[PDB]
Design a protein around this ligand. Structure first.
Ligand SMILES: CC(C)(O)C(=O)Nc1ccc([N+](=O)[O-])c(C(F)(F)F)c1
Length: 242
């Protein structure tokens, strides 16, 4: 299990949001901590990414690019998994110190979005998703969204991505049935991340006017990279269209 050793080895540990659970909830309190968390998880995603088989093989610009476009969806998927495994999909386990109940779901003004994420969480359960299958899947999510014009080295990227599908397929092996389900589940992540993108973006735009704080690294990705996703420039790669 060489490849599976790696994915296991490199999987991020616990990441806290820094939130104050003793102070009553608040739109700005909540979304300030989520933003905070976004930042930290982003840092973790970068270090994880750069330890993937094949990854540092990409043009350094393709690296920053793929990390920045895939970031939200990667966070969404892992958050779904944690939610599934730590609290039976009942609530959303953003972090140890930031767990969303219905109340926070509403109060963060992210109710509809929290609903889809919560549903994705339940899918892990419904589909009896193994932790091994969760790792390959997540790994594959990093190769899921690119500029329509392609990347600086697009060929190396497709060979990479090809190899990751192959690895998902081995980790499965009507195995045809199993793959279909897992690929449909992977496709489902993009609509949620797109919804999350819209919300983050709108939030940025109005943020000095509401009291939410955006870490510098966040605000750059939301203002520079996210609009390309929202404008159709950077599109997701789907298994089944759509
Ligand atoms: C930009 C916005 C408010 O920060 C945001 O979506 N934050 C955020 C932080 C962490 C996590 N997480 O995966 O644990 C997520 C989300 F993936 F759940 F959406 C969003």
């Amino acid at each position: 299990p060489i490849f599976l050793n790696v994915l296991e080895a490199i999987e991020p540990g616990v990441v806290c949001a820094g939130h104050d659970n003793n102070q009553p909830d608040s739109f700005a309190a909540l979304l300030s901590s989520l933003n905070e968390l976004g930042e930290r998880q982003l840092v973790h995603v970068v270090k994880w990414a750069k330890a993937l088989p094949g990854f540092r093989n990409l043009h350094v610009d393709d690296q920053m690019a793929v990390i920045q476009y895939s970031w939200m969806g990667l966070m969404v998927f892992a958050m779904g998994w944690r939610s599934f495994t730590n609290v039976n999909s009942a609530m959303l386990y953003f972090a140890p110190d930031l767990v969303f109940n219905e109340y926070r779901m509403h109060k963060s003004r992210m109710y509809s979005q929290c609903v889809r994420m919560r549903h994705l969480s339940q899918e892990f359960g419904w589909l009896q998703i193994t932790p091994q299958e969760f790792l390959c899947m997540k790994a594959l999510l990093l190769f899921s969204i690119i500029p329509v014009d392609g990347l600086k080295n697009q060929k190396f990227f497709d060979e990479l991505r090809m190899n990751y599908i192959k690895e998902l397929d081995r980790i499965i092996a009507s195995c045809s049935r199993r793959f279909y389900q897992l690929t449909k589940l992977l496709d489902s992540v993009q609509p949620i991340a797109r919804e999350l993108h819209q919300f983050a973006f709108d939030l940025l735009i109005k943020s000095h006017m509401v009291s939410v704080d955006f870490p510098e690294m966040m605000a750059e990705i939301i203002s520079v990279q996210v609009p390309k996703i929202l404008s159709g420039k950077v599109k997701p790669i789907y298994f089944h269209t759509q």
